[PDB]
Amino acid sequence: SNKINDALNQHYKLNVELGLVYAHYAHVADDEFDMPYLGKFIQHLSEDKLGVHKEYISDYFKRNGMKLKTDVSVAVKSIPSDAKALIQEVYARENEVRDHVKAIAKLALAEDDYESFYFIQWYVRDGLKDLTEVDDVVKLFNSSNDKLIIEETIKEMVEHEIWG
Amino acid sequence: SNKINDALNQHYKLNVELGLVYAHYAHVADDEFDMPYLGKFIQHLSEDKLGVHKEYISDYFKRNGMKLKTDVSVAVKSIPSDAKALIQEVYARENEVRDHVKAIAKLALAEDDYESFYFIQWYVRDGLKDLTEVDDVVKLFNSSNDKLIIEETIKEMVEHEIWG
Amino acid sequence: SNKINDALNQHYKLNVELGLVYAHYAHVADDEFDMPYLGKFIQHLSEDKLGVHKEYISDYFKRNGMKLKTDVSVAVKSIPSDAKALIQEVYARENEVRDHVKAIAKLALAEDDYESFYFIQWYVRDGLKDLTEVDDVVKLFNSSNDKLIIEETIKEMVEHEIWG
Amino acid sequence: SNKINDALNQHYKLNVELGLVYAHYAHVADDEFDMPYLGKFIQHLSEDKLGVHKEYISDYFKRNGMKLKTDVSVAVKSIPSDAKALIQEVYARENEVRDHVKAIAKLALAEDDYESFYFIQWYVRDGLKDLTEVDDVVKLFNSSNDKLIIEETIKEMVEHEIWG
Amino acid sequence: SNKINDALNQHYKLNVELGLVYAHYAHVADDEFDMPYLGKFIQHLSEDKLGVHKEYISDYFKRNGMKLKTDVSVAVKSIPSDAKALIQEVYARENEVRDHVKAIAKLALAEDDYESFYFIQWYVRDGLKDLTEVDDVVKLFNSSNDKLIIEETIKEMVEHEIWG
Amino acid sequence: SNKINDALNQHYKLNVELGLVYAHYAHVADDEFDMPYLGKFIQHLSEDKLGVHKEYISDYFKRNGMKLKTDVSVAVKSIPSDAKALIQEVYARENEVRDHVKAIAKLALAEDDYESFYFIQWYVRDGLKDLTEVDDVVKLFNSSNDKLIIEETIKEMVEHEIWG
Ligand SMILES: [Fe+3]
Ligand SMILES: [Fe+3]
Ligand SMILES: [Fe+3]
Ligand SMILES: [Fe+3]
Ligand SMILES: [Fe+3]
Ligand SMILES: [Fe+3]
Numbered sequence: 014s015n016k017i018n019d020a021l022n023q024h025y026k027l028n029v030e031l032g033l034v035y036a037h038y039a040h041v042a043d044d045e046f047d048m049p050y051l052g053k054f055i056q057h058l059s060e061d062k063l064g065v066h067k068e069y070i071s072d073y074f075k076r077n078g079m080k081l082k083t084d085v086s087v088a089v090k091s092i093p094s095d096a097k098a099l100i101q102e103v104y105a106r107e108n109e110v111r112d113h114v115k116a117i118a119k120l121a122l123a124e125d126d127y128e129s130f131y132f133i134q135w136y137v138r139d140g141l142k143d144l145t146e147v148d149d150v151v152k153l154f155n156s157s158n159d160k161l162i163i164e165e166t167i168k169e170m171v172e173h174e175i176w177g
Numbered sequence: 178s179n180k181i182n183d184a185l186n187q188h189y190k191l192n193v194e195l196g197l198v199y200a201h202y203a204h205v206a207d208d209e210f211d212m213p214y215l216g217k218f219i220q221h222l223s224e225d226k227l228g229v230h231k232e233y234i235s236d237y238f239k240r241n242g243m244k245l246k247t248d249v250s251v252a253v254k255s256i257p258s259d260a261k262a263l264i265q266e267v268y269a270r271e272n273e274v275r276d277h278v279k280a281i282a283k284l285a286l287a288e289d290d291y292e293s294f295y296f297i298q299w300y301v302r303d304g305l306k307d308l309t310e311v312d313d314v315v316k317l318f319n320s321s322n323d324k325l326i327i328e329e330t331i332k333e334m335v336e337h338e339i340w341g
Numbered sequence: 342s343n344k345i346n347d348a349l350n351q352h353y354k355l356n357v358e359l360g361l362v363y364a365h366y367a368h369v370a371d372d373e374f375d376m377p378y379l380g381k382f383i384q385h386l387s388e389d390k391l392g393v394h395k396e397y398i399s400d401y402f403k404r405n406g407m408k409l410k411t412d413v414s415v416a417v418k419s420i421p422s423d424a425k426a427l428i429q430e431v432y433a434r435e436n437e438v439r440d441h442v443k444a445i446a447k448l449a450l451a452e453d454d455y456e457s458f459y460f461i462q463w464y465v466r467d468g469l470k471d472l473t474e475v476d477d478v479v480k481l482f483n484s485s486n487d488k489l490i491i492e493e494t495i496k497e498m499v500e501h502e503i504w505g
Numbered sequence: 506s507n508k509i510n511d512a513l514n515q516h517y518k519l520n521v522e523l524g525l526v527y528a529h530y531a532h533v534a535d536d537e538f539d540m541p542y543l544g545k546f547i548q549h550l551s552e553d554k555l556g557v558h559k560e561y562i563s564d565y566f567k568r569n570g571m572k573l574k575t576d577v578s579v580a581v582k583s584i585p586s587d588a589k590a591l592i593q594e595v596y597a598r599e600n601e602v603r604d605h606v607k608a609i610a611k612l613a614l615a616e617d618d619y620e621s622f623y624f625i626q627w628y629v630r631d632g633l634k635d636l637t638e639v640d641d642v643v644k645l646f647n648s649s650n651d652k653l654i655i656e657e658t659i660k661e662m663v664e665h666e667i668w669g
Numbered sequence: 670s671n672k673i674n675d676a677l678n679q680h681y682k683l684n685v686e687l688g689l690v691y692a693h694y695a696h697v698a699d700d701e702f703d704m705p706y707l708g709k710f711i712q713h714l715s716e717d718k719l720g721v722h723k724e725y726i727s728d729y730f731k732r733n734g735m736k737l738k739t740d741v742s743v744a745v746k747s748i749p750s751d752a753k754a755l756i757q758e759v760y761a762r763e764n765e766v767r768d769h770v771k772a773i774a775k776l777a778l779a780e781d782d783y784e785s786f787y788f789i790q791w792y793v794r795d796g797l798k799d800l801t802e803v804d805d806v807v808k809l810f811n812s813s814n815d816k817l818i819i820e821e822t823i824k825e826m827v828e829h830e831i832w833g
Numbered sequence: 834s835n836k837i838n839d840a841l842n843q844h845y846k847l848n849v850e851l852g853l854v855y856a857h858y859a860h861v862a863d864d865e866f867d868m869p870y871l872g873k874f875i876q877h878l879s880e881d882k883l884g885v886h887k888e889y890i891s892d893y894f895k896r897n898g899m900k901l902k903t904d905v906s907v908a909v910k911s912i913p914s915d916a917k918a919l920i921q922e923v924y925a926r927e928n929e930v931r932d933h934v935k936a937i938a939k940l941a942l943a944e945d946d947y948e949s950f951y952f953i954q955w956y957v958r959d960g961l962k963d964l965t966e967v968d969d970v971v972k973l974f975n976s977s978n979d980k981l982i983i984e985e986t987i988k989e990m991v992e993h994e995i996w997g
Contacts, residue, residue, distance in 0.1 A: 033193070036235075037247045044239050047480050063227070071200075075208050083201045089247045160484040161494055233503065240473055240504070282783045291446045291465050299503055301783050309732055316867050320980040330981055339725065339791055340732070361521070364563075365575045372567050391555070397831065399528075403536050404801055404832070411529045411581045455774045455793050463831055539808050652812040653822055685853070692891075693903045700895050719883070727856075731864050739857045739909045 017129050018079045020117045025070050026084060027113065031106060032063030033087045038099060046096045048160065050167040054150065055103065058143070073132055097154045104151050107144040114140050142176050181293050182243045184281045189234050191277065194251050195270060196227030201253045202263060210260045212324065214331040218314065219267065222307070237296055261318045268315050271308040278304050306340050345457050346407045348445045353398050355441065358415050359434060360391030365417045366427060374424045376488065378495040382478065383431065401460055425482045432479050435472040442468050470504050509621050510571045512609045517562050518576060519605065523598060524555030525579045530591060538588045540652065542659040546642065547595065550635070565624055589646045596643050599636040606632050634668050673785050674735045676773045681726050682740060683769065687762060688719030689743045694755060702752045704816065706823040710806065711759065714799070729788055753810045760807050763800040770796050798832050837949050838899045840937045845890050847933065849905050851926060852883030857909045858919060866916045868980065870987040874970065875923065893952055917974045924971050927964040934960050962996050
């Protein structure tokens with residue numbers, strides 16, 4: 014089936030682009046907003062987005078017999094004003110990748126291709142896991158106004174059976 | 178100094194592009210040329226190119242006070258015919274990054290910016306180290322004709338005080 | 342060469358004077374500004390400035406055959422108003438010692454005296470390391486207004502491969 | 506009481522000056538008189554003179570409520586002829602610091618300031634301890650004429666309940 | 670570049686010749702001057718001169734792509750009169766190899782060949798290290814006149830972070 | 834006896850020359866014939882030829898009362914075409930040193946100098962041991978034609994009561 018091929022290629026592309034964008038956001042949050050631990054958090058997100066999230070697609074392509082296509086285009090020319098807008102933008106990106114994964118899963122189940130469904134279950138779980146991990150931090154900036162308190166909270170954060 | 182800034186930005190861009198290209202080459206060498214261990218070798222190269230090689234530039238920029246710029250554009254539309262041409266192309270890329278690093282070091286020393294010189298010494302070493310690691314394998318395909326012998330050699334390979 | 346001798350003697354003198362000044366600043370920050378941990382931080386700076394930073398110059402003089410000269414004159418008759426101005430003054434002193442080291446390195450390389458260059462590389466690294474360590478704390482007083490939060494941050498602070 | 510303040514400030518100044526002078530003497534004894542172990546001995550003396558001997562005064566000032574004053578002036582323009590005159594000069598400096606401490610203790614007891622007396626007991630002990638440690642070595646150069654025998658003796662030296 | 674090739678070939682030749690000469694001097698100091706430990710010292714020097722000091726040049730030639738040339742010519746027909754002249758001659762040889770290394774480093778930096786500079790830094794350090802190790806012993810024969818005292822000193826000698 | 838002196842001096846000279854020649858052959862076999870393990874083998878041979886094989890003669894000369902003479906002259910201006918001719922030349926050198934040792938032993942026994950006979954027994958054993966070790970490898974190139982198989986054999990080789 015070529016529809017699953019196209020959808021998984023789109024997901025590969027999206028994952029690479031998000032990895033690079035998150036890396037840049039982590040750097041700019043460390044260098045300008047004077048919050049190194051928000052930088053470490055977004056850097057861990059970027060590493061997970063550039064590692065297993067695309068290595069698994071490459072491996073599945075090796076295993077079932079599809080063709081891979083590399084095509085990336087990223088140019089970060091705009092950044093938000095403070096840490097709150099930055100973390101809300103990261104949250105929106107996660108909320109979008111959730112819907113993309115849902116669309117791929119529906120397409121796979123409508124093709125009678127149950128190996129691809131069993132494959133995409135991992136993503137329909139990890140999407141919610143990571144969105145929750147990011148929402149836990151976007152909730153912080155609604156709770157206090159001293160930067161160092163939020164810093165220590167995120168520090169102790171970085172220091173389940175269904176989802177986790 | 179802005180010249181060092183421009184040169185290091187160019188190096189950042191080059192490193193990201195090479196990382197992606199090497200990842201694709203590793204996959205296509207595993208999937209088509211029936212050599213998984215050449216795939217593992219090129220994958221380790223891609224990981225080193227996408228990790229520390231750009232994280233160190235990001236950290237140095239954080240530390241001295243320069244501005245980072247993300248701009249990538251990669252589209253792999255051509256691949257070689259057999260493993261020998263693939264490994265020779267990888268070798269050529271390494272031979273090019275060597276010259277790029279040499280130019281950066283000359284520019285840094287001609288600016289009276291000795292912190293950047295002390296910083297780029299690491300790269301003028303790692304360039305030769307990695308070029309040697311790749312030449313060791315491009316020498317293999319001039320020595321035998323059975324694929325599995327080369328496979329076992331690379332397997333035992335993956336299994337100094339100045340350079341290393 | 343006598344020019345390198347004069348430059349290294351000037352550096353010896355500067356290091357001794359900075360050691361004493363930092364010791365006094367640590368005491369006055371402990372006794373008046375009610376911040377003992379800022380005192381401990383500046384005391385560790387003073388110890389590093391009065392120890393190895395001049396012992397290494399004495400050793401190099403013993404080793405290559407130059408003459409040492411002791412001449413100190415310090416009189417701290419003015420102190421800043423609050424901890425922020427104190428830490429900014431410490432930062433300025435670090436930013437000055439950086440330029441002094443850069444000048445010595447240029448002079449050494451222009452003399453064809455490569456042993457002195459290999460010797461001063463240690464200083465062109467440690468300058469950036471220590472300036473970063475002090476900037477990390479001068480960033481704190483732009484982030485909060487409760488003294489004890491900054492205290493706990495510095496406490497957990499006191500509790501790399503290129504630079505560090 | 507301000508008299509104790511003045512006396513302890515004088516002792517602080519004297520200790521810093523002696524520290525620097527002893528450091529220079531250690532270097533010149535290592536570099537010219539071809540005796541590295543006499544250098545190590547005088548260096549340990551200089552470290553003890555520049556460390557606890559003034560840190561304790563700084564701490565006591567923090568604790569009782571007096572003001573500290575930093576004012577140093579050292580210029581070593583003359584050095585003795587051989588190791589014997591050097592060690593005799595060090596001995597004379599110790600014999601002088603003994604009398605200075607005795608004067609401070611008398612002044613403290615004549616003021617009805619018994620905390621300062623309890624504080625200065627440590628110094629009236631350490632003075633005799635260190636003078637004895639130096640006399641043990643100035644006795645050596647009255648016993649032999651081979652430099653290396655004295656060297657081995659001092660080496661094994663560097664390798665009580667009332668005083669010690 | 671062929672100039673660096675010629676210079677490194679000259680250094681290879683010089684190192685082999687010095688190795689052989691030092692071996693002969695060690696033997697003759699053991700057999701005639703009745704000092705076995707001076708023999709052991711000079712033998713360790715000869716081993717370091719014949720081992721890594723030329724193996725590293727061979728390895729660098731393998732690594733960058735230059736050609737090696739073996740041409741040796743040694744004939745020890747004259748020896749000094751006592752141990753003092755012997756150790757002073759060894760010292761002079763070290764003082765000469767220092768200048769040879771300095772010339773090679775200048776030539777490398779004037780060619781814009783920074784890999785050779787990074788390579789020769791090791792030698793510009795080891796030269797000073799070894800010259801200091803030999804001067805420590807040539808200082809002994811200015812301190813005493815009993816042979817066995819010097820023997821025990823050298824015995825305990827044979828029994829840093831920048832240089833060492 | 835001076836005849837034994839002359840013969841042992843000749844053996845000393847021969848051993849030094851063979852050491853240097855073998856070192857060069859090891860390098861050229863690593864750099865040109867693309868066989869690093871043959872290089873390691875010949876390097877171990879060169880180390881044994883330059884170490885104990887001449888240190889024992891130096892020690893025996895110290896012990897019985899003869900005079901040592903250093904005179905070397907080597908110029909490697911010709912090398913064979915492939916690894917087989919190289920290893921056959923090494924074998925011929927071993928076959929020659931065997932006969933030289935036999936001649937020395939006959940001369941010693943014909944002089945009624947039984948200490949020299951007891952001394953040379955070690956060499957009349959080690960000659961056969963080393964010739965066998967080299968013949969084991971010159972037999973390999975008569976058994977296969979893939980370079981990497983021979984490589985793995987020599988690798989596992991490098992990884993008795995009369996002779997050994
Ligand atoms: Fe994830
Ligand atoms: Fe690398
Ligand atoms: Fe420091
Ligand atoms: Fe003391
Ligand atoms: Fe050495
Ligand atoms: Fe042998």
